Amino acid sequence: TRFISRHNIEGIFTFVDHRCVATVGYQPQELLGKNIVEFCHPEDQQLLRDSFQQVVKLKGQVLSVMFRFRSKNQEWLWMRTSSFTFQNDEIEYIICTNTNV
Amino acid sequence: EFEVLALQASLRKAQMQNHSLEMTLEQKTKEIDELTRICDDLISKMEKI
Amino acid sequence: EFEVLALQASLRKAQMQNHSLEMTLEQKTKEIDELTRICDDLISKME
């Protein structure tokens, strides 16, 4: 019940390891190219967006956010995701460790 | 005559499965390469710290 | 008799080439799960 995913600053999946299948039901190709917020519960999207705004401002240190994720089987899974940017000093990407709770 | 056709079929089956295996293998290599990148970058990031 | 032997040969070659792939695959799967374990332990400690 844990998988890694790297994103761009906009929140778009650019990689996701195969443990996502077991975690949320989707194949990696199904997620790649999409914004994580598209899979996020409407009530939680503002909270999630606000996360992606701050990791970029901190540049290095780690944030954490709790939100509901719509699975392939169409049920709302509680995900605790920890995020942080990676510096080269601009930004290459945001890594995320999504954990189902 | 009829025997050739049986082997001819069993060959292409074999060859199908192999191509199918190296499909899995091809997408399974992408995953390795991409994780190595992330991993090397976590070593590099944690070293500054 | 020639076209059958040459055919049986192709088959044992494909079969050989298959065992190779199924082993190469298994080895690549281990390598995944390890880079998984490594990456997770590092993130796990960066918080």
From Swiss-Prot, chain A:
Domain of life of the native organism: Eukaryota
PAS domain span: 1-59
PAC domain ranges (all copies): 64-101
Subcellular location per the Swiss-Prot or TrEMBL entry: Nucleus
Assembly behavior: Monomer. Homodimer only upon binding to a DNA. Efficient DNA binding requires dimerization with another bHLH protein. Interacts with TACC3. Interacts with HIF1A, EPAS1, NPAS1 and NPAS3; forms a heterodimer that binds core DNA sequence 5'-TACGTG-3' within the hypoxia response element (HRE) of target gene promoters. Forms a heterodimer with AHRR, as well as with other bHLH proteins. Interacts with NOCA7. Interacts with TACC3.
Function (record text): Required for activity of the AHR. Upon ligand binding, AHR translocates into the nucleus, where it heterodimerizes with ARNT and induces transcription by binding to xenobiotic response elements (XRE). Not required for the ligand-binding subunit to translocate from the cytosol to the nucleus after ligand binding. The complex initiates transcription of genes involved in the regulation of a variety of biological processes, including angiogenesis, hematopoiesis, drug and lipid metabolism, cell motility and immune modulation.
Name of the protein in question: Aryl hydrocarbon receptor nuclear translocator
UniProt gene name: ARNT
From Swiss-Prot, chain C:
Subcellular location: Cytoplasm; Cytoplasm, Cytoskeleton, Microtubule organizing center, Centrosome; Cytoplasm, Cytoskeleton, Spindle pole
Highest taxon in the source lineage: Eukaryota
Cystine connections: none
Tissues in which the UniProt entry reports expression: Embryonically expressed.
Protein family membership: Belongs to the TACC family.
Subunit note: Interacts with GCN5L2 and PCAF. The coiled coil C-terminal region interacts with AH receptor nuclear translocator protein (ARNT) and ARNT2. Interacts with CCDC100/CEP120. Interacts with CKAP5 independently of clathrin.
Main function: Plays a role in the microtubule-dependent coupling of the nucleus and the centrosome. Involved in the processes that regulate centrosome-mediated interkinetic nuclear migration (INM) of neural progenitors. Acts as a component of the TACC3/ch-TOG/clathrin complex proposed to contribute to stabilization of kinetochore fibers of the mitotic spindle by acting as inter-microtubule bridge. The TACC3/ch-TOG/clathrin complex is required for the maintenance of kinetochore fiber tension. May be involved in the control of cell growth and differentiation. May have a role in embryonic development.
Protein name, UniProt field: Transforming acidic coiled-coil-containing protein 3
Organism: Mus musculus (Mouse)
Residue numbers of the full-length protein present here: 585 to 629 of 631
